[PDB]
From Swiss-Prot, chain A:
Origin superkingdom: Eukaryota
Effect in UniProt of substituting K125Q: In ARMD9; results in resistance to proteolytic inactivation by CFH and CFI
UniProt-annotated site: (Microbial infection) Cleavage, residues: S508, G509
Glycosylation sites per record: N63
Positions of disulphide bridges: C594-C629
Protein name in the entry: Complement C3 beta chain
Full-sequence portion shown in this chain: 23 to 667 of 1663
Sites bearing Phosphoserine, chain numbering: S16, S48, S267, S273
Coiled coil (residue ranges): none
Native species: Homo sapiens
From Swiss-Prot, chain C:
Cellular component, GO annotation: extracellular region
Ranges where the record places region Essential for activity: 30-47
Protein family: Belongs to the SCIN family.
Lineage: superkingdom: Bacteria
Major localization class: secreted
Gene: scn
Location of this chain's protein in the cell: Secreted
Identification of the protein by name: Staphylococcal complement inhibitor
Function noted in UniProt: Involved in countering the first line of host defense mechanisms. Efficiently inhibits opsonization, phagocytosis and killing of S.aureus by human neutrophils. Acts by binding and stabilizing human C3 convertases (C4b2a and C3bBb), leading to their inactivation. The convertases are no longer able to cleave complement C3, therefore preventing further C3b deposition on the bacterial surface and phagocytosis of the bacterium. Also prevents C5a-induced neutrophil responses.
Alphabetical UniProt keywords: Secreted, Signal, Virulence
């Protein structure tokens, strides 16, 4: 019963490298394969380059990597021929040839000064590339004022720039944009506000005691006002603060709360009473809304003024919220379900040191991570019976009335034959770091007349949308469990899935396919390494003009770009800047895996990780024509 | 120099106002150990005294990208100056700069010496010989302020510079920040014209032109530029496209090629047809992207069972059918983009219809009818079976035409042939079905002209269908062959409705009697997407010409980059013409931008009287209907005054006012910029207060203080008033004529006690001495703000910076209070000399100023030196002349 | 004459080593035309501490301008060895 199966990514890409998995189980000896890609519909011959042969040495496992050189999506007809037995199918293509990136040397510009942006080309993988590009510059009204068209070839991915802001030009929020010429529909947006300003010499932090406001906390949301000069020392002055009621995008200014206190020593104290709160507007209604502050510090010398502002403080009686979005939405009947609740303080930030327990099993407990996600589990009975989960937060100091709760649901995993053949992958979910060894647990589930036939599992590793690595693992008859030692490199960062499965023919002439996916977030780090420090081994504050050697440590052969910035520009405006953390935060939003947690059936687990399965006896995965993942249905 | 301090002569000034610097690019050249490279750079820290924050990005070809997020190098010193200059200040207006002297000494308060230097761009309390310096005492770990008044007399990037040095301690640091002194003005962008372009619809001629007037800007402040921008916007529309059929309940079309030639085609005819369609409609997704390869094998599947009856040219037993061989070229010349077809089994059954089944007139005969006789469709009507049979084989060989234009000699003659018999007999047709079958047998050649064109447009009953009495599957096939032309023709005002009838029949195909009813209700609906204009248009190509263009101007708004805004601009004022051309619609908008009560809703009135301790009084009213919210009262004293520590707490206790407990500290010595927070400024009336100020510091020439009124929500709508005990409102006493300003803060410049030959040679060879002339006053004008004297130089004793020949007239200027200085009468000679700092205006149009250093002496006439009383002066002046022209100064 | 006393041997060698670097303050103040806006603010201000202090014959202002003026020559011989 030689049968020929085959896999790939769920949504392909362009001018990029996607892999794919040949196979020949129960095959005899050799088998010359020839792979190909024809545009759809018809025949144009786009990439037929690949060839391979499945030794009985690579366990009947062959492997190949390629480079694929309206308003409706276009597709790619892909073909594989195993000696004579040919199998083919179609997969959705995405116009995106990678990502594009911006950094404005200043966050706010005086009309007349120059702007120094710089952009960085890369692919679906984080390496340098040389293509071609378009770069405009729009005013706050939406009109391209100047554009360019250079290419990052033999430039090493990095690009130089300079545009002068005319004396007369509109003030507000300008917007610079870019996009690969190959793909004119995928464009990127970065901004710099033009305004007539003078740099302040200090900074102002607005810090309420509470993250959020309890509705029945008479005392009210208090707030500490701490002013400090740019260079560290403590600012002396008097300030002006004002509060308000936001309701989505609308802001209810409260002129009955406008205070003034003595910023002494770079620390002043302002409170707002719960009565100046009720008469700016019942109170089971203001729940859901958030508030916002507006400080304004003017020194006792009358030279400078700074304007600080906090926004999005929630009036939640139930401090912690309970998210089920790192959580799988399916299970496997008769085996453990790992629970990755996502607790948040009211603003959006994750909770800490807050026990949570199952609805039943009062004994069961979890402990908070520095991240707002703990570790829980429970045995599932051998039922295809949907699992109704009512998590309850159990942190003391509060009541079973102030404790927020959230109910999600996990669904069965449908096995072909349904004869009763499951696979369950158990993993030491740890805050994995580059250089660690992570175990991989295989819990088979079958009667003992067809377990003398499963001699190898097969698997894969997702990563930002591409396929990272593959091969096989060995299982001997009588071992319903084999561990798989895997070492972590810098690449799986940020998050990476993993899919596994076997093939056998059992029951009554029925080749069977059972599988199981899985998703883990590995520590978010720039993959190589880089730091900037002060060269001198002894640091004393250099006076204006002096020489200080500046040491630096990075990867060899790497190019490096550098720029300094006065901390007096980030006291009128410190947004639109660049965070590596805003870097990965975007390379995840562009994943093809969507329900990392689980799978409905052996095919669902594939589209629910970013993969299309197909074979030579009928079984195959869902045809994904949906670029943007399943628009989250709350 | 020898004081316990640092003169202004070494205090290098902190001019690093700018935020961006050190934007360098450096690679990892050094050899690396363990994949880690070390670079050392020696940077020169900018002058700004704050805390520079870093930020860098590493791109390694191996190690993708990293963020070596920046740390922090704090830059501080023991004593510096935070020169706080605005982004700009208007010319001719008096303002108030702030300059904070931060002393972060442990517990050593600094005895400072802060001195504003002169700048001939700023009429301040510091002139060319006078210094405006003071002596303050900043307590330890504190911020102390110091007000400085000025009047920017010149536009353009000007210069301000404060340097301070402590007594007894040897610290020193200035800050040279520069401010953009702009001419007063209002940011405006008048619209020049807002019109539409389209040489198709507008002008009614090609090359539609559009003349354009220059911007009037009647009210443009002099010496200021102004730009104009232009916009190029394509505004295309899309319409007249209808939806193909959902193919959704059309899941019976792919039944497998099986049987004898004729049964091998009743059931493969719906096959290929579903394929050609869902190809050019993009329905493949919701149907099954996958059943397509369960169908491209039931097309080439019959291709080798159908290649199993092709006698030498149905049954192979039976005589070849002229109907199954001219439909063997209709199911093949379309399944050529789908499967492997032989240009020998296609180009070897079309040289058989021209050479075997063609009469001398191009009419086609039927020898052996086809055994299945319902599949022939609508020819089955023996009615005109050489007008529905001469029009059917006529479309099976105009279809195979490009494939093999070289494999058949016999084509070029058979094509015109058939078509000459038909066009003649085209006026001789009844059946709406033979009018549409010949109709499209013809319209692929360009001959349906005249009478054959209008008889084919009326045959459509209701004009959307070509129908005959009786069978319906011969009306759909008539409506199809009818739309076939409609589009082969490039007309689409009669296609819209014809396509709303065919999918109103929800004809999902198949059936018995429908092997032609299926092949046409689709290929027609299948070809309607490749023609669809989609209303895509716009080949605009406009030409620009402008009084600045030495070069030609050209862009083009093609459909692919049509919404790409193609804009152009300049800095100069012109007239010009535009010249549009080509299809497509767009819109044109153009806009120039140029330069067209300080109180804005805040009254202020600041008063100063004696009680040498004085008493101040301020008046503020809000020009609102609502009593304005929390407002503020900024106050910087005059040099030598601290508030009476007993009236800063009589207004701090009263409600509606406040004095942060931070203003009771420091006491009487350190308090020269106050902050009295107000809780409301009524709109009804002025709300007035007042306190006391003693005289603790004694000094000459005190400083016009101030009082600033603004709400907290807008630092912008404020009203600042000044107050001096001497001039009326705080404004120093100056002489203005028009645009020009000067510092008349001086005394009445003016008994011949002594004047000898030596007394002159010394004062005429001094440093400032620049010009020396013997002029004769010609004209004497006098204004209400100052006088002037147009004197002509009769000789240049000493040429200065001003290049002036003997005879020309140089204008002299003097205050109106100097009319008693020297009554410069007309037609009298005078010996004069001054400094170069007295020049006024700009070469060659300069103007002299009779200042304190301008020597004015009366020169006796020719017949006046005869007087025995003017001789002593005539000899001195005469000798002084020769002692200068040839000799010179003794230094 | 025999031999100096207590405040007679340390206040004078502190005015010898503040006059050995005041003799060539006309030699190091001129080579900061080839260096930054740093070596021209730090050797022009740190020069008025080595002339008023050598002239007040005080033991404190002389050991406060012989190092202030001996840190900015080791800074000027240093930025003169990347310039050869
Ligand atoms: C045969 C083998 O061991 N390695 C292959 C090799 O093509 C590569 O590691 C990968 C492509 O990503 O596919 C697998
Ligand atoms: C009437 C008119 O055209 N005025 C507009 C004004 O609304 C806009 O705020 C300004 C921005 O600079 O440009 C101009
Ligand atoms: C993911 C993986 O294991 N890839 C490897 C790669 O190191 C190498 O390019 C190749 C050499 O044949 O073997 C494969």
């Amino acid at each position: 019963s030689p049968m020929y199966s085959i896999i790939t990514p769920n949504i392909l890409r362009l001018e990029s490298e996607e892999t794919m998995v040949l196979e020949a189980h129960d095959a005899q000896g050799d088998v010359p394969v020839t792979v190909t890609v024809h545009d759809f519909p018809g025949k144009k011959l786009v990439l037929s380059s690949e060839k391979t042969v499945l030794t009985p040495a690579t366990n009947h496992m062959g492997n190949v990597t390629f480079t694929i050189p309206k308003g409706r999506n276009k597709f790619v007809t892909v073909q594989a021929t195993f000696g004579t037995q040919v199998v083919e199918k179609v997969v959705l293509v995405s116009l995106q040839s990678g990502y594009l990136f911006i950094q404005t040397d200043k966050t706010i510009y005086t009309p007349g000064s120059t702007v120094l942006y710089r952009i960085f080309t890369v692919n679906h993988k984080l390496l340098p590339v040389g293509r071609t590009v378009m770069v405009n510059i729009e005013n706050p009204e939406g009109i391209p004022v100047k554009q360019d068209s250079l290419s990052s070839q033999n430039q090493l991915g990095v690009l130089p720039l300079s545009w002068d802001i005319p004396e007369l030009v509109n003030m507000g929020q300008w917007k610079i944009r870019a996009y690969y010429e190959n793909s004119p529909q995928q464009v990127f947006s970065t901004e710099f506000e033009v305004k007539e300003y003078v740099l302040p010499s200090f900074e102002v932090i607005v810090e309420p005691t509470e993250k959020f406001y309890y509705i029945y906390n008479e005392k009210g949301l208090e707030v500490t006002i701490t002013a400090r000069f740019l260079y560290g020392k403590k600012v002396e002055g008097t300030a002006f603060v004002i509060f308000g009621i936001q309701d989505g995008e609308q802001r209810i200014s409260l002129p009955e709360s406008l205070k003034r206190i003595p910023i002494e020593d770079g620390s002043g104290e302002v409170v707002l009473s719960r009565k100046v709160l009720l008469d700016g507007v019942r109170a089971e209604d203001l729940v859901g809304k958030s508030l916002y502050v507006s400080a304004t510090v003017i020194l006792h010398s009358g030279s400078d003024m700074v304007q600080a502002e906090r926004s999005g403080i929630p009036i939640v009686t139930s401090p912690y919220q309970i998210h089920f979005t790192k959580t799988p939405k399916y299970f496997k009947p008769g085996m453990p379900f790992d629970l990755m609740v996502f607790v948040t303080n009211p603003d959006g930030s994750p909770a800490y040191r807050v026990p949570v327990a199952v609805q039943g099993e009062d004994t069961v407990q979890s402990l908070t991570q520095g991240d707002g996600v703990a570790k829980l589990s429970i045995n599932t009975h051998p039922s295809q019976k949907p699992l109704s989960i009512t998590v309850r937060t159990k942190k003391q100091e509060l009541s079973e009335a102030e404790q927020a709760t959230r109910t999600m649901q996990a669904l069965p995993y449908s096995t072909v034959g349904n004869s009763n053949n499951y696979l369950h992958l158990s993993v030491l979910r740890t805050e994995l770091r580059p250089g660690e060894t992570l175990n991989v647990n295989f819990l088979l589930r079958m009667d003992r007349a067809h377990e003398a036939k499963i001699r190898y599992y097969t698997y894969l590793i997702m990563n930002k949308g591409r396929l990272l690595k593959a091969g096989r693992q060995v299982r001997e008859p009588g071992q319903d469990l084999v561990v798989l030692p895997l070492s972590i490199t810098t690449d799986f960062i940020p998050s990476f899935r993993l899919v596994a499965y076997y093939t056998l023919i059992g029951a009554s002439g029925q080749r069977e396919v059972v599988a199981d996916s899985v998703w883990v977030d590995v520590k978010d780090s720039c993959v190589g390494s880089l730091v900037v420090k002060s060269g001198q081994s002894e640091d004393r504050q250099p006076v204006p003009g002096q020489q200080m050697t500046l040491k630096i440590e990075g990867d060899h052969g790497a190019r490096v770009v550098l720029v300094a910035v006065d901390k007096g520009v980030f006291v009128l405006n410190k947004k639109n800047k660049l965070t590596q953390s805003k870097i990965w935060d975007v390379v995840e939003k562009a994943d093809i895996g969507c329900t990392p947690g689980s799978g409905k059936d052996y095919a669902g687990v594939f589209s629910d990780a970013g993969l299309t399965f197909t074979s030579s006896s009928g079984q195959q995965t869902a045809q994904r024509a949906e670029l943007q993942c399943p628009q989250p249905a709350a | 120099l020898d004081e316990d301090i640092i003169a202004e002569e070494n205090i290098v000034s902190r001019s690093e106002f700018p935020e961006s610097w050190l934007w360098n690019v450096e690679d990892l050249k050094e050899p690396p150990k363990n994949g880690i490279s070390t670079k050392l750079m020696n940077i020169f820290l900018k002058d700004s005294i704050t805390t520079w924050e870093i930020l860098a990005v590493s791109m390694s070809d191996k190690k993708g990208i990293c963020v070596a997020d920046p740390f922090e190098v704090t830059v501080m010193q023991d004593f510096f100056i935070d020169l706080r200059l605005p982004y700009s200040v208007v010319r001719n207006e008096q303002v108030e700069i702030r300059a904070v002297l931060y002393n972060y000494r442990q517990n050593q308060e600094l005895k400072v010496r802060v001195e504003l230097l002169h700048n001939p761009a700023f009429c301040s309390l510091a002139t060319t010989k006078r210094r405006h310096q003071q002596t303050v005492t900043i307590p330890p770990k504190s911020s102390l302020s110091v007000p400085y008044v000025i009047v920017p007399l010149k536009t353009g990037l000007q210069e301000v510079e404060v340097k301070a040095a402590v007594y007894h301690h040897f610290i020193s640091d200035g800050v040279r920040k520069s401010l953009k002194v702009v001419p007063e003005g209002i940011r405006m962008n008048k619209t020049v014209a807002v019109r539409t372009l389209d040489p198709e619809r507008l002008g009614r001629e090609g090359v539609q032109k559009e003349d354009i007037p220059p911007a009037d800007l009647s009210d443009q402040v002099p010496d200021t530029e102004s730009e104009t921008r232009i916009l190029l916007q394509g505004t295309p529309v899309a319409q007249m496209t209808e939806d193909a059929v959902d193919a959704e309940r059309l899941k019976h079309l792919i039944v497998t090629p099986s049987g004898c030639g004729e049964q091998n085609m009743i059931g493969m005819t719906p096959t290929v047809i579903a394929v050609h369609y869902l190809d050019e409609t993009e329905q493949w997704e919701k149907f099954g992207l996958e059943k397509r390869q369960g169908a491209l094998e039931l097309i080439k599947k019959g291709y080798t069972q159908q290649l199993a009856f092709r006698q030498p040219s149905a049954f192979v037993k039976r005589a070849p059918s002229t109907w199954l061989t001219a439909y063997v070229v209709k199911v093949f010349s379309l399944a050529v983009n789908l499967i492997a077809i032989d240009s020998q089994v296609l180009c070897g059954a079309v040289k058989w219809l021209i050479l075997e089944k063609q009469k001398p007139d191009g009419v086609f005969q039927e020898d052996a009818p086809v055994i299945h006789q319902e599949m022939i469709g609508g020819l089955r009507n023996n009615n005109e079976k050489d007008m529905a049979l001469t029009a059917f084989v006529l479309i099976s060989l105009q279809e195979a035409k490009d494939i093999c234009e070289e494999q058949v000699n016999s084509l070029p003659g058979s094509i015109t042939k058939a078509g000459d018999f038909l066009e003649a007999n085209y006026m001789n047709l009844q059946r709406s079905y033979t009018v549409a079958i010949a109709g499209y047998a013809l319209a692929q050649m360009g001959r349906l002209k005249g009478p054959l064109l209008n008889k084919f447009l009326t045959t459509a009953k209701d004009k959307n269908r070509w129908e005959d009495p009786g069978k319906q599957l011969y009306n759909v096939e008539a409506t199809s062959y009818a739309l076939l032309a409609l589009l082969q023709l490039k007309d689409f005002d009669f296609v819209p409705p014809v396509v709303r009838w065919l999918n109103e029949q929800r004809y999902y195909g198949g059936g018995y009697g429908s092997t032609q009813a299926t092949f046409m209700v689709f290929q027609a609906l299948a070809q309607y997407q490749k023609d669809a204009p989609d209303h895509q248009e716009l080949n605009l190509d406009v030409s620009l010409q402008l009084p600045s263009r030495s070069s030609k101007i050209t862009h083009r708004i093609h459909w692919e980059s049509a919404s790409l805004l193609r804009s152009e601009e300049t800095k100069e004022n012109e007239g010009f013409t535009v010249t549009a051309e080509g299809k497509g619609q767009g819109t044109l908008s153009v806009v120039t931008m140029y330069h067209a009560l300080t109180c804005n809703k805040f009254d202020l009135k600041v008063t100063i009287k004696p009680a040498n301790t004085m008493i101040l009084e301020i008046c503020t009213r809000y020009r609102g209907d609502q009593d304005a919210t929390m407002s503020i009262l900024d106050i910087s004293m005059m040099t030598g005054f601290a508030p009476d520590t007993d009236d800063l707490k009589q207004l701090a206790n009263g409600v509606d006012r406040y004095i942060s407990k931070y203003e009771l500290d420091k006491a009487f010595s350190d308090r020269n910029t106050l902050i009295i927070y107000l809780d409301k400024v009524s709109h009804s009336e002025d709300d007035c207060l007042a306190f006391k100020v003693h005289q603790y510091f004694n000094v000459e020439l005190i400083q016009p203080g101030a009082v600033k009124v603004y709400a907290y929500y807008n630092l912008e709508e404020s009203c600042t008033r000044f107050y001096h005990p001497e001039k009326e409102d705080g404004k120093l006493n100056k002489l203005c004529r028009d645009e020009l300003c000067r510092c008349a803060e001086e005394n009445c410049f003016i008994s011949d006690d002594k004047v000898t030959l030596e007394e002159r040679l010394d004062k005429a060879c001094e440093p400032g001495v620049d010009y020396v002339y013997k002029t004769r006053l010609v004209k004497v004008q006098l204004s209400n703000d100052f006088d002037e004297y147009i004197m002509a130089i009769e000789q240049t004793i000493k040429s200065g910076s001003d290049e002036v020949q003997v005879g020309q007239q140089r204008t002299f200027i003097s205050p109106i209070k100097c009319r008693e200085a020297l009554k410069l009468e007309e037609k009298k000679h005078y010996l004069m000399w001054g400094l170069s700092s007295d020049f006024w205006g700009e070469k060659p149009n300069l103007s002299y100023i009779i200042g304190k250093d301008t020597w004015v002496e009366h020169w006796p006439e020719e017949d006046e030196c005869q007087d025995e009383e003017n001789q002593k002066q005539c000899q001195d002046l005469g000798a002084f002349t020769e002692s200068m022209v040839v000799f010179g100064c003794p230094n | 004459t025999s031999l100096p006393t207590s405040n007679e041997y340390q206040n004078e060698k502190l005015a010898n080593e503040l006059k050995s670097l005041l003799d060539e303050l006309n030699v190091n103040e001129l080579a900061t035309g080839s260096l930054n806006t740093y070596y021209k603010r730090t050797i022009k201000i740190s020069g008025q501490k080595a002339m008023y202090a050598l002239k007040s014959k005080d033991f404190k202002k002389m050991s406060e301008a012989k190092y202030q003026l001996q840190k900015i020559y080791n800074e000027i011989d240093e930025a003169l060895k990347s310039k050869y």
